[PDB]
Give the backbone structure.
Amino acid sequence: RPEWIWLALGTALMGLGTLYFLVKGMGVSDPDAKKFYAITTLVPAIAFTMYLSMLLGYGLTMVPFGGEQNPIYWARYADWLFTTPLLLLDLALLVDADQGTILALVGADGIMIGTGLVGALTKVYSYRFVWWAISTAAMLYILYVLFFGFTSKAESMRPEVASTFKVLRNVTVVLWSAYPVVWLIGSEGAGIVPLNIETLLFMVLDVSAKVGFGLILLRSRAIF
Amino acid sequence: RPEWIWLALGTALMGLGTLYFLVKGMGVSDPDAKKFYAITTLVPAIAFTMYLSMLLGYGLTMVPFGGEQNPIYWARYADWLFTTPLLLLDLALLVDADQGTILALVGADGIMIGTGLVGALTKVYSYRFVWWAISTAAMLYILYVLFFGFTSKAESMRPEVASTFKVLRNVTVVLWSAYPVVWLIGSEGAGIVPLNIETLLFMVLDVSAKVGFGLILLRSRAIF
Ligand SMILES: CCCCCCCCCCCCCC(=O)OC[C@H](COP(=O)(O)OCC[N+](C)(C)C)OC(=O)c1cc(Br)cc(I)c1
Ligand SMILES: CCCCCCCCCCCCCC(=O)OC[C@H](COP(=O)(O)OCC[N+](C)(C)C)OC(=O)c1cc(Br)cc(I)c1
Ligand SMILES: CCCCCCCCCCCCCCCC
Ligand SMILES: CCCCCCCCCCCCCCCC
Ligand SMILES: CCCCCCCCCCCCCCCC
Ligand SMILES: CCCCCCCCCCCCCCCC
Ligand SMILES: CCCCCCCCCCCCCCCC
Ligand SMILES: CCCCCCCCCCCCCCCC
Ligand SMILES: CCCCCCCCCCCC
Ligand SMILES: CCCCCCCCCCCC
Ligand SMILES: CCCCCCCCCCCC
Ligand SMILES: CCCCCCCCCCCC
Ligand SMILES: CCCCCCCCCCCC
Ligand SMILES: CCCCCCCCCCCC
Ligand SMILES: CCCCCCCCCC
Ligand SMILES: CCCCCCCCCC
Ligand SMILES: CCCCCCCCC
Ligand SMILES: CCCCCCCCC
Ligand SMILES: CCCCCCCC
Ligand SMILES: CCCCCCCC
Ligand SMILES: CCCCCCCC
Ligand SMILES: CCCCCCCC
Ligand SMILES: CCCCCCC
Ligand SMILES: CCCCCCC
Ligand SMILES: CCCCCCC
Ligand SMILES: CCCCCCC
Ligand SMILES: CCCCCCC
Ligand SMILES: CCCCCCC
């Protein structure tokens, strides 16, 4: 498994991010800042677990489509199922989103991850892309609400909060956008980008969307 | 206009690609190889014209949305309107696609470019993304036919033709995929990636999808 090196690097980076966020979060008194630390430390903690499992050869299955037996890391979705709504929750607490908006985004998020996983396991080559399309539409719904909805909510906050939101929103739009493209061209879809390069790409995206995101959030005044 | 440097580089690269393809095409006797040279030389020739126009300050308009006046290079679409179906035509001649398939892809292609252009000029921020979504669906229809349809047609050709098709199909899937993401995150959509970086990205994509593509096609035995 040539991709082990990027699984090992992902594990190391997630583990370091977790440990650092834990040290910093433990030393924080402010009750508001603490919620954000708790949510944000969990994100690389879940990713570290899943990266470790995959490094050790768990969460990989073979799925037949296109006349080959294809390796599918399904453990990625067990990670994303829990880490993606927690990242949304960070953004939603920052702008004081309402309960029904949170529920809509978490629900859409579940649809996005669940249909992605169904698509990843589908044996009919053509139906893989139907699931992928539904997954991407649920994603674009999320991005829409974050871009239009949350930006409007953030503008009623003090400028330091709105500023931090904008940065994190931009990071999120750019980083989340790339995932369905990686899936499309990688071993899950078209089969163009080989599994090792694809693992590198997801690792760079994962670390940036989780540790990178966390660093921007947890170093800002906006959480106090 | 900080983006001038990437417009100038794009012009130079398109011009060099045109000139080189013209020199080589002019020296070719084989009647089949000549069709492919004629179509493929036109692709960077049209791009060079549009890149030159933009460098000299044509094909740029200001479109109001999101409370700002935004610069939109519309000359890109005048290029893509003609260059994208010609690239499809190259692929279709390679695999001997039928007339109705060619007509479907060219039509979908027109929809893709035309709705993209409407989206790029739309003053209501939200409706920009509706046009973008329709444009991307027309694109995904094209990619679907190239991936499933044309691959099946290429498998009935001699292996050297099928091999060349696969490479060009993979280049196309990967390169075309990136365009709607650039538009989404760039000055046309979300406004996250500034115009200069966006111009760099489109220039790299343009040169790769046109000169890169042409180099692979025109250096192969598959056209003789
Ligand atoms: C190669 C396999 C993985 C293991 C290798 C790990 C690389 C080691 C790098 C450590 C160099 C810096 C020393 C240090 O421990 O802290 C440096 C640096 C400083 O931390 P910090 O202690 O907060 O700074 C205090 C500075 N004063 C002494 C002035 C008070 O910490 C980080 O920025 C950091 C960020 C992440 Br994400 C994770 C971590 I862990 C640290
Ligand atoms: C900086 C602003 C743009 C202007 C700078 C242009 C860069 C100049 C590079 C030329 C170095 C090589 C010399 C040459 O003219 O041909 C080299 C090279 C060789 O061409 P070619 O003549 O086909 O090779 C023949 C070799 N034998 C003599 C053995 C028969 O040509 C290219 O590969 C090429 C590809 C593209 Br796309 C465009 C072009 I034009 C050429
Ligand atoms: C050639 C075999 C090397 C085996 C090393 C495997 C364990 C890696 C654990 C991950 C700890 C961080 C280091 C990452 C650098 C490769
Ligand atoms: C004031 C800080 C900048 C505001 C906006 C952030 C720019 C977008 C950042 C996204 C970079 C992610 C790397 C992409 C790797 C594929
Ligand atoms: C016969 C079943 C119909 C399948 C419909 C698929 C539509 C989903 C979008 C297709 C994206 C395909 C891009 C493929 C490039 C490998
Ligand atoms: C600082 C002003 C420089 C002006 C040069 C403008 C003309 C560029 C024409 C393009 C020819 C290829 C060279 C590209 C390298 C910048
Ligand atoms: C035998 C040659 C390789 C077969 C498949 C080609 C791999 C995909 C090439 C696409 C690289 C384009 C660069 C992407 C820049 C964003
Ligand atoms: C009220 C008008 C409805 C608009 C529907 C837009 C759906 C199109 C997909 C949205 C993609 C938005 C991503 C935005 C990230 C900037
Ligand atoms: C108490 C606030 C600091 C961070 C809290 C930790 C939340 C659980 C993550 C522990 C994983 C090792
Ligand atoms: C607050 C408004 C609730 C809207 C309903 C959620 C829609 C789910 C997304 C559709 C994805 C295909
Ligand atoms: C947005 C993702 C960019 C794609 C990176 C392409 C690398 C593919 C190389 C294929 C190796 C054979
Ligand atoms: C005759 C075959 C070689 C290439 C033919 C040229 C097609 C028109 C492009 C001319 C642009 C300068
Ligand atoms: C040969 C079959 C013709 C199919 C009709 C073309 C459909 C256009 C694409 C829809 C994009 C929204
Ligand atoms: C698939 C396209 C990749 C996106 C490249 C991101 C560069 C954005 C930097 C923003 C500068 C402020
Ligand atoms: C084609 C993608 C469909 C995404 C739906 C987004 C609608 C915005 C909510 C009003
Ligand atoms: C959501 C994108 C819709 C694209 C349609 C592709 C259908 C494949 C033709 C049978
Ligand atoms: C959540 C919508 C269900 C649509 C499933 C379509 C299944 C086709 C393979
Ligand atoms: C080609 C389909 C036409 C749909 C246009 C919808 C316009 C909404 C702004
Ligand atoms: C979340 C959708 C699951 C439906 C399962 C269908 C598998 C053939
Ligand atoms: C993506 C890492 C940068 C985080 C530093 C925050 C700047 C105040
Ligand atoms: C190709 C669709 C064009 C329709 C124009 C509508 C502009 C408001
Ligand atoms: C993308 C440029 C490579 C073209 C060389 C063709 C290999 C036979
Ligand atoms: C033909 C099925 C395409 C799925 C589209 C769902 C948004
Ligand atoms: C060769 C493709 C690797 C690109 C990944 C860099 C982030
Ligand atoms: C990736 C962009 C980070 C900028 C940080 C400023 C708060
Ligand atoms: C609500 C409009 C979304 C456009 C989807 C077209 C494929
Ligand atoms: C800083 C972003 C530029 C990346 C473009 C390289 C192809
Ligand atoms: C970008 C991949 C090019 C490989 C060329 C082999 C024909």
Observations:
- Chain B touches chain A through 19 residues (CB under 8 Å).
- Strands of chain B lie at 60-65, 68-73.
- Residues A 192; B 167, 170-171, 174-175, 178, 208 surround hexadecane (ligand 7) (CB under 6 Å).
- The two ends of chain B are 45 Å apart (CA to CA).
